[PDB]
Amino acid sequence: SASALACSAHALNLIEKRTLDHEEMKALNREVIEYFKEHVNPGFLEYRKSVTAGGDYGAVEWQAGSLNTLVDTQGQEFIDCLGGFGIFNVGHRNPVVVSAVQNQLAKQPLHSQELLDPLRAMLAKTLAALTPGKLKYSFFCNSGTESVEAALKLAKAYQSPRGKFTFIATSGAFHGKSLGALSATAKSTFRKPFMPLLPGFRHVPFGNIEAMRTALNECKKTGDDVAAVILEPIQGEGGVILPPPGYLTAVRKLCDEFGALMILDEVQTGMGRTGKMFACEHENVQPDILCLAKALGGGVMPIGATIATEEVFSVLFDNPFLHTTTFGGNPLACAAALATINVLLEQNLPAQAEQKGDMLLDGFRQLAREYPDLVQEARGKGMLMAIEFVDNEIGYNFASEMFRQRVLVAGTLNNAKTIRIEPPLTLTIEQCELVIKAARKALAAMRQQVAFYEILHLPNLNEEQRNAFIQSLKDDPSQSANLLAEAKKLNDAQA
Amino acid sequence: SASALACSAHALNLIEKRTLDHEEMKALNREVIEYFKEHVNPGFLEYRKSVTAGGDYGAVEWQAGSLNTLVDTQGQEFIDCLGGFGIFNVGHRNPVVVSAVQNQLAKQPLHSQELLDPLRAMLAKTLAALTPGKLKYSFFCNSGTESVEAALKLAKAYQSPRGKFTFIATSGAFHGKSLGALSATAKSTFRKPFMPLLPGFRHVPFGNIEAMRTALNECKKTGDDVAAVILEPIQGEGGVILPPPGYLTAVRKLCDEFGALMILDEVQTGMGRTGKMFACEHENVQPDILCLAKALGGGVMPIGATIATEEVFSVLFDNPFLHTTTFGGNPLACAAALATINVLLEQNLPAQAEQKGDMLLDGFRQLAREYPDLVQEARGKGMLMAIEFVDNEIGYNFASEMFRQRVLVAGTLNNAKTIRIEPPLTLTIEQCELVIKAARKALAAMRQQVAFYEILHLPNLNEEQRNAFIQSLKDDPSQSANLLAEAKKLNDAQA
Amino acid sequence: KETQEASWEIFTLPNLNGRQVAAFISSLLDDPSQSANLLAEAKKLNQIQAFKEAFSLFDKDGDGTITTKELGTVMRSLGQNPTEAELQDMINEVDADGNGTIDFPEFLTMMA
Ligand SMILES: [Ca+2]
Ligand SMILES: [Ca+2]
């Protein structure tokens, strides 16, 4: 058809463009839909259809608008309440992060892998200064799942000479999709097609200290002593699930008691999202191993970090090549990360995340009491929030209605009824009120919608008074509640 | 020591600097050695000590010099014959790749993960055009090990409903260090501390078609039918091991016969290094799954890609979230990759790699016959070469002596006697001659050294008869190999 | 193992000939214990030899002593313009024997 050279050349021509005319846009959207269908995954097209209405399923990314907005190929601007599921904590194209990445790009993007690269040392020192307690040594990779892999391998190298092999995770947990991390991840549909996974992985209910104590004690009784416990401080993909106060402290004490390592997965909750730099700081809990990614890249670079105490990390001192990764700790990613830490500390973005989080969650809870027919509950901590609906169809219509009002939201991998709100920490107060209002109009449209369907499906109604009923439903929406009652008032009287 | 804010600020000040005075340089080198010792890994410091002489163990990266040179914090320029173990196929800071990355950085670095990003579609289409046969669908991640993880998960999702679970790899293979990929990787020291790994992984000798046929037939007889065979077309970390002609074709035929999938790991051999775009093109072999990374990033970005036929990749169509990764397919990485494919095709860098590879390997083979006391053999294909020495200490002294002459080389993870030569495909002929001469002076110095030791351990000669020999060796270092001859010519007569 | 590393580090010193490196090698084979100290004074010895060389090239007429004009020649050559009094002060500061010229050690003392 065309050669790879032609395709690449076209792609670079399109990378160099800053805006698109209407016919260039139509051709590009048509192209991207085709190539998604034939070379990426057609399932994605169906998914976005299930969270949109009409051609909304075919919005194509183009450029960052401001710190908190994204602009598609048609110039439509969206407020980003998705934040790349926790990536854009410091907004899109943060000037400081973009600046650092450009400077280091001017010097050297990737390292030789042989000589000492200075930004890896600088970032390791910074992270040692920034992490609680004895967390001292850092290993750098490129993703969250890789960080969890490094955590598991550290735990294994430390505990295998001590006769401990089994790992305890929690139900509803998500720790990545690489096979190692996938053994810890808990969602059935993510795991079943790839079994068998790693042996000796067990799961207990999240937030239930007695269940976990039971698991450790039974594992000790049967000779399957636990090497490590891994958990998120707050389950992001589980639907923003908050553990009871003191749970993390009790888990730390339990691991200390049984001689198991505590691995905290802060891939999503880290870098200021929950109101503090790390969620474990809410209870002043120091794990043995801490996992970071996503937001640590500043929304510019991919990066992951596994920080551990010298006691545990020392298992790699005799053989520094025991665990490595091809691109880990490259100068570009390190520059991004240092820039992000600087931005978060200088603008005190964690505290801002607490304030704006409290405000948005207040709004969402008020909407929750006003719409109990659609919203089950709203929950969150800092700027990691979620709204759980009555069914999945309802939350679907919510995501769609918010997308039509140009506010970006998305579901949670382990919870089909829940929609997450994870906007940048730089979201302004004006945009906070705009998002609350958008949620209100969404819920209103959804209530009028369910009324419209219920009125449409009544079987004991001829066509004329149905046309009158939906006609009135359109012309006076605030009477929605009454007319629906009236509809059934008549649907019963001729049964 | 200091607060995280201070550390970050210092790091950004150092990122913005373009040159260093010597007190700046000395302070920075001292800093990076300290932070490597206390926050990264002290073992690395010891390793570089074993491959250097004096303060050469403490060379710190600073900036790319030219396409094929690296400049440390002291202004010393090195010819890069390491290429990041296959990363810098198109050189350091390739203007085209840097340009594309800069433009897309101006537009948007990371995607929302919800809307359609166009460069993912463009890159998937380009890779479909560039890959042999029915390879059609691409999954994008951030590293080689992640690409291998995606390959394994594709094979599992395809073969588990067909009752096949076991995987066959080869000894001496390297496929990554994440637990999934590590189950396929073959080096004992990399695997033992993290066992148990994935069940049902077996290894056969590389290049031995009858051994592999035996493994498949026995697995079928016992009901442990093989889901997939995974191998590198040429083993990189094994010491650049070349299979017999027709091996890849026979492996494809065998997989077709038993109904197993063929997974080709081209993380190292891909992107033109072996004289063609992919090593599998030497025999016109199309695998079911192809793994790419390293060089696909153009030496600017981290990226990985798993390409598969629609037949196998279709296992992700019903549920597009069955396998994902946080940063995979981000616009920066895609821009880098497209720029790299463009550069490779427009400058026909594969063919250049064949020519320059033939030249360098000719030089190395001539040095090999001139120095059989130190070199066992030199091997290679395209610009993926290696020199295997008699001992590990010998190859160590070679790496050190080449580093002293400001030519970068490094060892191979699975082969302690072998030093790899993996320079950029953009290496100039002048630099080819320079590296050949550097290798010559290295081997000369090493012969002088081994002679100097061997003269010291000869038993049958008096305490002063040696000192004449050492003396003559040092102030008149010309009688060298022939001198060692004299030494033994007296030792065996005095026996 | 370390006796060998010592043996090669002493062997590779640029400013020693075979006779002394060989003598030292003897001292090290007889004593693996007196290494890093023997190694230390050997390294130092290299420093003295190279210092000797440079000094020799600072004695233009090769007569083994350095005068104010030879000094002067080097000082003027390095872009400077010393006066007679400055040169005399420099020599006077280290002139242990008061003969007005610089011998071998006194030059080492100037450097110290
Ligand atoms: Ca004189
Ligand atoms: Ca005197």
CB pairs under 8 A between B and C: 42
* A427 DSSP assignment: -
Can you give the length of chain C in residues? 112
CA atoms of A18 and B103, how far apart (whole Å): 9
Q: In the Cβ-directed half-sphere of C49, how many Cα atoms lie within 13 Å?
A: 13
Per the CB < 8 A criterion, the answer to whether B280 and B263 are in contact is no
Which residues, at least 6 apart from A465, have a Cβ–Cβ distance to it below 8 Å?
A490
For residue C107 the two structure tokens come to: 């030059």
Element (H, E) at B377: strand B375-381
Residue of A10, A61, A87, A237 for testing the chain B interface, max B β-carbons within 10 Å: A61
State the DSSP string of C17-80: -HHHHHHHHHHHHH-SSS-HHHHHHHHHHHHHHHHHHHHHTT-TT-SS-B-HHHHHHHHHHTT-
Per the CB < 8 A criterion, the answer to whether B409 and B52 are in contact is no
Element (H, E) at B369: helix B349-370
- Give rounded-to-5 percent helix, strand, coil for chain A: 50, 15, 30
Q: In the Cβ-directed half-sphere of B179, how many Cα atoms lie within 13 Å?
A: 32
Which residues, at least 6 apart from B478, have a Cβ–Cβ distance to it below 8 Å?
none
Place of tokens 């239930």: A208
Instruction: Report chain B residues whose CB lies below 8 A from the CB of C19.
Output: 467, 471, 475
Q: Which of B297, B138, B350, B340 is closest to A11 using CA atoms?
A: B340
Chains touching chain C through at least 3 C-beta pairs below 8 angstroms are B
Q: What is the SS3 string spanning B59-73?
A: CEEEEECCCCEEEEC
Q: Which of B7, C91, B476, B69 is closest to A118 using CA atoms?
A: B7
CA atoms of B146 and A143, how far apart (whole Å): 9
Place of tokens 């400081």: A96
CA torsion A156-A161-A164-A166 (nearest 10°) is 30
Query: What's the sign of the alpha-carbon dihedral A57, A63, A66, A67?
Result: positive
For residue B77 the two structure tokens come to: 């320029």
State the DSSP string of A269-281: TTTTTTSSSSGGG
Q: Which amino acid is at B420?
A: R
Instruction: Report chain A residues whose CB lies below 8 A from the CB of B183.
Output: 179
Cis amide linkage into residue A193, ω under 30° from 0: no
Do C and A touch, counting CB pairs below 8 Å (3 needed)? no
Q: Which residue of B has its CA nearest to C1?
A: B453
Q: Is C19 on the interface with B (CB under 8 A)?
A: yes
State the DSSP string of A37-70: IIII-HHHHHHHHHTSSGGGGG-BEEEE-SSSEE
Which residues, at least 6 apart from A183, have a Cβ–Cβ distance to it below 8 Å?
A152, A167, A197, A198, A201, B179
Q: Which amino acid is at A407?
A: V
Q: Which amino acid is at A93?
A: R
CA atoms of A441 and A370, how far apart (whole Å): 12
- C102 CA to middle of ligand 1, Å? 9
Q: Is B466 on the interface with C (CB under 8 A)?
A: yes
Per the CB < 8 A criterion, the answer to whether B109 and A302 are in contact is no
CB atoms under 10 Å from CB of A102, counted, come to 17
Instruction: Report chain C residues whose CB lies below 8 A from the CB of B472.
Output: 18
Q: Which of B344, B337, B484 is closest to B425 using CA atoms?
A: B344
Per the CB < 8 A criterion, the answer to whether B302 and B380 are in contact is no
Q: What is the SS3 string spanning B389-455?
A: ECCHHHHHHHHHHHHHCCEECEEECCEEEEEEECCCCCCCHHHHHHHHHHHHHHHHHHHHHHHHHHH
Instruction: Please report the beta strands in B124-277, taking only residues with DSSP state E, as ranges in sequence order.
Output: 135-141, 166-170, 201-204, 226-231, 261-265
CA atoms of C94 and C84, how far apart (whole Å): 17
In the annotated binding site of C for Ca(2+), the residues are: 59, 61, 63, 65, 70, 95, 97, 99, 101, 106
Per the CB < 8 A criterion, the answer to whether B67 and A152 are in contact is no
CA atoms of B206 and C58, how far apart (whole Å): 66
CA atoms of B60 and B76, how far apart (whole Å): 10
Query: What's the sign of the alpha-carbon dihedral B251, B253, B259, B261?
Result: positive
Q: Which of A479, A153, A493 is closest to B178 using CA atoms?
A: A153
Q: Which ligand is nearest to the CA of C107?
A: 2
Query: Which spans in A371-479 are helix H?
Result: 392-404, 429-457, 463-475
Phi, psi (deg, nearest 5) at residue B53:
-130, 125
Do B and C touch, counting CB pairs below 8 Å (3 needed)? yes
Q: Which of A11, A10, A20 is closest to A73 using CA atoms?
A: A20
Which residues, at least 6 apart from B137, have a Cβ–Cβ distance to it below 8 Å?
A39, A40, A41, B124, B128, B307, B308, B309, B310, B313
- B148 CA to middle of ligand 2, Å? 76
Element (H, E) at B252: helix B247-258
State the DSSP string of B34-92: HHIIIII-HHHHHHHHHTSSGGGGG-BEEEE-SSSEEEETT--EEEESSHHHHT-TT-T
Report the b/e string of B66-75 with b at 16+ CB within 10 A: bbbbbbbbee
Per the CB < 8 A criterion, the answer to whether C44 and C50 are in contact is no
Query: Taking CB atoms and an 8 Å limit, are B468 and C22 in contact across chains?
Result: yes
The rounded Cα B230 to chain-centroid distance in angstroms is 18
- Looking at the DSSP bridge assignments, the partners of residue B420 are B386, B410
Q: Which residue of B has its CA nearest to C4?
A: B453
Experimental method: X-ray
Q: Which amino acid is at A39?
A: H
The closest CB to that of C22, out of B449, B453, B467, belongs to B467
The closest CB to that of A345, out of B4, B39, B126, belongs to B4
Query: Taking CB atoms and an 8 Å limit, are A322 and B70 in contact across chains?
Result: no
Give me the resolution in angstroms, 1 decimal.
2.6
CA atoms of B342 and B97, how far apart (whole Å): 9
Per the CB < 8 A criterion, the answer to whether A441 and A400 are in contact is no
Query: What's the sign of the alpha-carbon dihedral A402, A403, A407, A411?
Result: positive
For residue B364 the two structure tokens come to: 């190395």
For residue B427 the two structure tokens come to: 């290496």
Per the CB < 8 A criterion, the answer to whether A142 and B144 are in contact is no
Per the CB < 8 A criterion, the answer to whether A40 and B121 are in contact is yes
CA atoms of B138 and B306, how far apart (whole Å): 6
State the DSSP string of B314-352: GGGTS-TTSS--SSTT-HHHHHHHHHHHHHHHHTTHHHH
